[PDB]
Amino acid sequence: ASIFRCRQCGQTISRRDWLLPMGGDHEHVVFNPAGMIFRVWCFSLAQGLRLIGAPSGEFSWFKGYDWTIALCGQCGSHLGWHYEGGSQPQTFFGLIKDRLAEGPA
Ligand SMILES: COc1ccc([C@@H]2CNC(=O)C2)cc1OC1CCCC1
Numbered sequence: 001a002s003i004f005r006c007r008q009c010g011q012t013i014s015r016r017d018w019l020l021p022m023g024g025d026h027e028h029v030v031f032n033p034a035g036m037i038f039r040v041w042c043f044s045l046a047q048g049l050r051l052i053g054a055p056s057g058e059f060s061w062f063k064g065y066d067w068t069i070a071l072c073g074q075c076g077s078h079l080g081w082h083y084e085g086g087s088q089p090q091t092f093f094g095l096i097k098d099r100l101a102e103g104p105a
């Protein structure tokens with residue numbers, strides 16, 4: 001259980017070692033304006049994604065950060081968001097926990 005793959009296709013995405021304690025915890029439970037709930041895990045780093053469009057501040061769940069949608073690079077599944085434009089760290093990834101599968105390296 002040290003690495004994370006896309007649950008839908010197996011693409012390698014991130015690692016447990018890359019989890020990022022944001023505001024005290026790597027886990028945040030948040031809602032979008034369409035009322036969908038997400039269990040978001042924060043990572044310092046991820047790979048195998050494809051970032052779509054340019055960043056937006058609108059409805060950002062993390063103060064001072066702008067988001068871009070992050071799809072699985074391989075299958076297109078929506079895995080989370082890349083955050084940028086902030087401070088300490090400047091950037092990070094918020095990934096949806098139930099869209100990842102955890103397993104050996
Ligand atoms: C599942 O969709 C989405 C769900 C959630 C957000 C978040 C709101 N606050 C954040 O920190 C990002 C953006 C989305 O993408 C939208 C942009 C255009 C259509 C959908």
Ligand SMILES: [Zn+2]
Nearest residue numbers: 006009072075
């Ligand atoms: Zn995938």
